[PDB]
Paper text:
The KdpDE two-component system regulates potassium homeostasis and virulence in various bacterial species. The KdpD histidine kinases (HK) of this system contain a universal stress protein (USP) domain which binds to the second messenger cyclic-di-adenosine monophosphate (c-di-AMP) for regulating transcriptional output from this two-component system in Firmicutes such as Staphylococcus aureus. The KdpD HKs of this TCS are prototypical among membrane-anchored HKs that contain an N-terminal sensory cytoplasmic region (NTR) in addition to a canonical transmembrane domain and a cytoplasmic C-terminal region.
Author numbering: 236 to 276, 280 to 363
Write the structure that this text describes.
Amino acid sequence: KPHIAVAISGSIYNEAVIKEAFHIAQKEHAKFTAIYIDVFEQYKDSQKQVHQHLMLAKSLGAKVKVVYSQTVALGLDEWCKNQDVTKLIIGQHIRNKRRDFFNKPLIDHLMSFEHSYKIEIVPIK
Ligand SMILES: Nc1ncnc2c1ncn2[C@@H]1O[C@@H]2COP(=O)(O)O[C@H]3[C@@H](O)[C@H](n4cnc5c(N)ncnc54)O[C@@H]3COP(=O)(O)O[C@H]2[C@H]1O
C-alpha cells in the first residue's frame, strides 16, 4: 500500500524536494502524489512558483492535488490521513527572524499532531 506524497510549497528549495521525492517513490514502487495546501494568510507573488512546482511533479508522474485549508499543518495532516499516505516528504525548515507561532517549522505542528504517517525531511543541497 505504499503511497508517497511530496508537500509542495512556493519556496525555491521545493523543486529539489520534488526530485528527491520522485526518486524515493520510484525506488519504493510507490504511488506518487504532490500536495499543496493553499492558505490565504504572505510570500507575495509565489503563486507562479507553486504552479511551476506542481507541473514539475506532474511531469514526474505524480498526481497533484490542491487543498484549501485554514492552516498548512491541518490541511496536510487531514489530507494525509484521508488519502492513506504512508510517507510524506517535506523540505527542511530554516529558521528566520519570525519566531511567532504560525512561523514555527511545519514539522513542529505535525509532531504535536502525532502524525501517523512517516515523514522524510529533505535538506538543502
Ligand atoms: N513560498 C515560500 N517562499 C519562500 N520560503 C518559503 C515558502 N514557503 C515556505 N518557505 C519557508 O522555507 C522552507 C522551505 O520549505 P520547503 O518548501 O522546501 O518544504 C516545505 C514543504 O515541503 C512543506 N510545505 C510547506 N508549506 C507547504 C504548503 N502550503 N503546502 C504543502 N506543503 C507545504 O513543509 C516543508 C517545511 O516547511 P516550513 O514552513 O517549515 O519551511 C519552509 C518555510 O520556512
